[PDB]
């Protein structure tokens, strides 16, 4: 971002300074994204999965579209804590979701009273909003993808405690050590996030097809 709120642990990746903000060197970025494409290719063809975490709005739409295109698993709304550690409780909740959806779609669509609208629809809508792509996550994600690491501390902490690789774009205002494998990019403009996430999904598809 600006030259005030920045992390000195990323002075390697800054290059000169325009009037107002820092300027990121691009050659390091192209080397990093080539390496990231290679690693995503190495990891995708394993009958596993790759998780997408859309913290900010740009990330929201971008990761939703890219995951749907690639058929992967993603989280889009607020990341409720404990998905990668309380996975028992999360899977209980998603089993609840599947059962209620099945019964509402098949059985009767009318239990007994006029009490479906008051709670039994609003809570289902809210839970479907929060969970989203977890309804298909069979096991444990192999490599998270985060747009803004400093705006998603809970997810990176939960992944690092379970010790699974992390890939993500680190702006100048983040510490590039919590994420084990980094690409320096601006996570504030909708254009760049789309390009990077689409490249990651394309690499996954090309390797795993």
Partner RNA sequence: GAAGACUGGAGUGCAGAAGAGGAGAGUGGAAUUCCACGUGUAGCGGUGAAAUGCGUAGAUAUGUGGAGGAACACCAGUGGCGAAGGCGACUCUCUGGUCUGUAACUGACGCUGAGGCGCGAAAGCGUGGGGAGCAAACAGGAUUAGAUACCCUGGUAGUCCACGCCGUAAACGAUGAGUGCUAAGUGUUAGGGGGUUUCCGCCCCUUAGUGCUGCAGCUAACGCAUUAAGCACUCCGCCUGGGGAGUACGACCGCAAGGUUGAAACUCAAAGGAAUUGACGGGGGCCCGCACAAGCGGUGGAGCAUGUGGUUUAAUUCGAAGCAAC
Partner RNA sequence: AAAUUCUAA
- Contact segment (CB under 5 A) with Mg ion among 25-33, 80-88, 153-161, 169-177 equals 169-177
Binds 188: which of RNA, Mg ion, none (CB < 5-8 Å by kind):
Mg ion
How many chain residues are in contact with RNA, going by CB under 7 A?
4
| From candidates 66, 152, 158, 171, binder to Mg ion by CB under 5 A | 171
Q: Are 34 and 203 in contact (CB under 8 A)?
A: no
Site for Mg ion contains 188 (CB under 5 A)? yes
95 binds RNA (CB under 7 A): no
With a CB cutoff of 8 Å and minimum separation 6, the contacts of 196 are 33, 169, 183, 185
> Cβ of residue 10: shortest distance to RNA, in angstroms?
10
Contacts of 6 (CB under 8 A, 6+ apart): 22, 172, 173
Of these, 3, 38, 45, 89, which contacts RNA (CB under 7 A)?
3
Q: Does 187 bind Mg ion (CB under 5 A)?
A: yes
Q: C-alpha 182: how far from its chain's center?
A: 15
Q: Answer with the entry of Mg ion, RNA, none that 4 interacts with (C-beta below 5 to 8 A by kind).
A: RNA
Whether 83 contacts 90, CB under 8 Å? yes
| CA quadruple 108, 112, 116, 117: dihedral sign | positive
Q: Which residue of this chain has its Cβ atom nearest to Mg ion in the complex?
A: 171
Least Å distance, CB 93 to Mg ion, is: 32
Comparison of 4 and 57: residue with beta carbon closer to RNA:
4
Secondary-structure percent of the chain, ordered helix, strand, coil, rounded to 5: 50, 15, 35
Binding stretches for RNA (CB under 7 A) = 3-4, 6, 8
């Amino acid at each position: 971002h600006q030259t005030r709120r920045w992390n000195p642990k990323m002075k390697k990746y800054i290059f000169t300074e325009r009037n107002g903000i820092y300027i990121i060197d691009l050659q390091k970025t192209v080397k990093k994204v080539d390496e990231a494409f290679n690693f995503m290719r190495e990891v995708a063809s394993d009958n596993g999965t790759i998780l997408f975490v859309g913290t900010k709005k740009q990330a929201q739409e971008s990761v939703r579209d890219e995951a749907i295109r690639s058929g992967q698993y993603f989280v889009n709304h607020r990341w409720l804590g404990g998905t990668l550690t309380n996975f028992e409780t999360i899977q209980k909740r998603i089993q609840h979701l599947k059962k209620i959806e099945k019964m509402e779609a098949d059985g009767t669509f009318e239990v007994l009273p006029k009490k479906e609208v008051v709670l039994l629809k609003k809570e289902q809508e809210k839970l479907e909003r929060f969970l989203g792509g977890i309804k298909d996550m069979k096991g444990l994600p192999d490599a998270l993808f985060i747009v803004d690491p400093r705006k998603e501390r809970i997810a990176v902490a939960e992944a690092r405690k379970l010790h699974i690789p992390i890939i993500g774009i680190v702006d100048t205002n983040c510490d590039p050590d919590e994420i084990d494998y980094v690409i320096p990019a601006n996570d504030d403009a909708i254009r760049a996030v789309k390009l990077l996430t689409a490249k990651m999904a394309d690499a996954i598809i090309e390797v795993n097809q």
